[PDB]
């Protein structure tokens with residue numbers, strides 16, 4: 001245990017109007033979120049270096065993050081029925097965040113609805129960079145099995161050499177959550193889910209006929225077992241499915257519904 | 265909200281706790297735990313301060329009526345503002361973690377710690393309490409060698425740390441009973457002879473997989489353990505819950521008969537205090 005974590009800290013007078021939130025506080029001429037509590041160092045380092053509009057802004061540490069008042073995507077997917085135009089809008093935003101991170105040789109390794117925060121204007125931002133991997137030409141692949149079982153790519157689960165396309169798979173599982181309300185095998189135990197991802201491979205939708213052919217194709221490109229065949233974030237940003245995306249304002253009735261449903 | 269407040273008034277002791285105890289020092293953050301000293305008697309105490317509400321009334325009443333030498337017992341309770349303070353016993357010899365990471369314990373010392381913990385587990389289980397966190401960090405030592413068990417405090421979310429002490433039935437999210445604490449004691453005994461718990465260099469998710477499949481990992485140096493100690497561990501770390509020993513059965517194990525008196529633990533306390541001074 002070392003103190004070179006004290007070296008990145010900024011060093012009660014800078015922020016006011018503290019109000020406790022979650023299981024994390026809100027404060028203020030901008031509105032901020034302050035999380036008060038070796039991987040914590042990597043998360044602060046990667047967030048400073050990788051600033052983009054589709055990533056929750058790390059502001060300072062003494063951890064001061066920007067505030068997104070519309071909750072997470074989880075509240076929306078578990079309390080509402082999203083249409084394809086809304087799903088395509090969320091997928092486009094996440095792919096813009098992934099295209100940015102991957103070009104900076106960063107693998108998120110934890111893409112899931114819980115890590116997608118929403119703004120009251122419909123803005124979509126990616127968070128939780130604890131599990132991220134910074135790759136390089138000297139070590140372009142990783143092997144560690146990290147992530148949330150239900151969202152993990154089969155190559156991660158089986159501890160094979162993997163790259164940024166593990167995040168593409170996780171995005172594909174997230175789009176399934178947007179359809180079905182839950183990731184595949186959620187009713188199972190996390191270890192039984194790991195076994196199922198490793199053996200079944202590409203998950204099968206409960207009702208595939210409900211989806212348009214263009215959405216089915218988009219998911220097939222995301223959830224392709226052959227990593228070379230699976231699309232990169234840059235390739236999938238050119239997919240026809242994203243062209244049916246509604247403006248980000250279309251997400252605000254969804255935020256309203258989740259807030260109304262979660263009054264307990 | 266109101267019924268819980270009135271029920272508390274009849275059970276809490278009158279008097280100002282701020283006048284009764286001194287030298288408050290935070291040791292954890294439901295609520296906050298402070299170490300303190302009784303100004304009148306010199307006793308060292310642990311004070312849990314806190315702002316589900318029906319569950320706490322029963323937990324106090326259980327603690328108050330049920331006493332055991334191998335657990336930190338309930339001493340008193342006070343209503344301080346909108347906070348409830350629960351005063352419990354504490355010990356000055358630190359935790360078992362300091363001893364296992366700074367000294368080499370012999371089997372006679374390990375047996376003495378296992379006997380004390382099993383006496384605490386027998387007591388808790390008869391009171392239909394499953395600890396769930398039996399680990400060296402929750403074992404408190406007294407300057408006379410006394411051993412006391414403490415506590416104090418989702419599939420979508422992330423877990424901080426490897427849950428190395430957890431039984432395979434806990435990991436696989438099955439219904440479970442008090443024998444989960446027996447498994448955890450078995451892991452604690454491994455920590456006592458190797459100086460570390462298993463799955464330390466392992467990722468928490470890889471640890472979960474390993475616990476669920478193989479149960480317990482192979483010992484780093486098994487030839488260093490006596491046959492009677494290896495048998496004791498086999499009974500503790502049995503995958504079949506019915507085959508795994510209960511606290512009452514394991515108190516009759518031959519391994520505990522090689523236990524040295526609790527005075528044999530005081531040189532270990534001295535060494536851990538010397539190692540963790542500066």
Ligand SMILES: CN1CCN(C2=Nc3cc(F)ccc3Nc3ccc(F)cc32)CC1
Pocket residue numbers: 322323326327328330331335336337388391393395413414415
């Ligand atoms: C339902 N709820 C579970 C936790 N309980 C206890 N937990 C403990 C656990 C310890 F490790 C030390 C002391 C205690 N205090 C106790 C003292 C007597 C007793 F019978 C049980 C406990 C209280 C009841």
